[PDB]
């Protein structure tokens, strides 16, 4: 079982655990975690958010061969549990300072849902990829500009949050993995760039 694999101690998830598109996995709709959490749960979590982690310091990425993330879902890892990791970071500014916070997103969700969203739709200009997905894949993935989420985290503690911008973005392609859901799914069938008026286009 891939959880086995996962969770050792020693373990570190690089793009070897990723699933491709085409595996059944990918379209399930995900399990629901209950809490307390079991052990390989809660270490699934914290090997998701370490994932990142490396993901975004270049050295780590180099030293792993991964690209660059801010998100990644159980499922990518054959694993079909409503399980989801974000990690957006704050950039620097044009003299080079950090931020004062260093993510403006950080967290490990277990059971996330939209409970509400805007009437207003927004996308990525440049649109979206995917780890899972060795294809090019042009278009605009049309999402809910505005979103409230729920999630609990790894201590079963519930968190009601609002998100917009790139943040909602991101948060909406992970929930969509755990229920099975594709980036494509959202692209436009006969035109992949057309604007419905009112589109948010997110720079
Ligand atoms: C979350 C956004 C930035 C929309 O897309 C990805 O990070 N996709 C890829 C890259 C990461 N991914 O597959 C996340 O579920
Ligand atoms: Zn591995
Ligand atoms: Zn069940
Ligand atoms: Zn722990
Ligand atoms: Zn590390
Ligand atoms: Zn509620
Ligand atoms: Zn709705
Ligand atoms: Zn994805
Ligand atoms: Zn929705
Ligand atoms: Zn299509």
Request: proline share 5%; glycine share 6%; charged share 30%.
């Given at each position: 079982?891939?959880?086995?694999?996962?969770?050792?101690?020693?373990?570190?998830?690089?793009?070897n655990d990723?699933?491709?598109?085409?595996?059944?996995?990918?379209?399930?709709?995900?399990?629901?975690?209950?809490?307390?959490?079991?052990?390989?749960?809660?270490?699934?979590?914290?090997?998701?958010?370490?994932?990142?982690?490396?993901?975004?310091?270049?050295?780590?990425?180099?030293?792993?061969?991964?690209?660059?993330?801010?998100?990644?879902?159980?499922?990518?890892?054959?694993?079909?549990?409503?399980?989801?990791?974000?990690?957006?970071?704050?950039?620097?500014?044009?003299?080079?300072?950090?931020?004062?916070?260093?993510?403006?997103?950080?967290?490990?969700?277990?059971?996330?849902?939209?409970?509400?969203?805007?009437?207003?739709?927004?996308?990525?200009?440049?649109?979206?990829?995917?780890?899972s997905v060795?294809?090019?894949?042009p278009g605009?993935?049309?999402?809910?500009?505005?979103?409230?989420?729920?999630?609990?985290?790894?201590?079963?503690?519930?968190?009601?949050?609002?998100?917009?911008?790139?943040?909602?973005?991101?948060?909406?392609?992970?929930?969509?993995?755990?229920?099975?859901?594709?980036?494509?799914?959202?692209?436009?069938?006969?035109?992949?760039?057309?604007?419905?008026?009112?589109?948010?286009?997110?720079?």
């Amino acid at each position: 079982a891939a959880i086995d694999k996962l969770v050792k101690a020693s373990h570190l998830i690089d793009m070897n655990d990723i699933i491709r598109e085409g595996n059944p996995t990918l379209r399930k709709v995900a399990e629901e975690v209950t809490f307390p959490l079991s052990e390989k749960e809660e270490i699934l979590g914290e090997k998701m958010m370490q994932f990142l982690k490396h993901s975004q310091d270049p050295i780590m990425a180099e030293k792993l061969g991964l690209r660059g993330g801010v998100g990644l879902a159980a499922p990518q890892l054959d694993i079909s549990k409503r399980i989801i990791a974000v990690l957006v970071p704050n950039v620097e500014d044009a003299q080079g300072n950090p931020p004062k916070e260093a993510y403006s997103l950080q967290e490990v969700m277990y059971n996330p849902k939209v409970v509400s969203h805007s009437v207003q739709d927004a996308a990525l200009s440049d649109g979206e990829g995917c780890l899972s997905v060795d294809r090019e894949v042009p278009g605009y993935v049309v999402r809910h500009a505005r979103v409230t989420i729920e999630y609990f985290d790894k201590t079963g503690e519930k968190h009601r949050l609002k998100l917009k911008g790139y943040n909602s973005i991101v948060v909406q392609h992970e929930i969509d993995h755990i229920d099975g859901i594709m980036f494509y799914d959202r692209i436009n069938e006969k035109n992949p760039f057309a604007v419905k008026e009112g589109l948010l286009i997110l720079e």
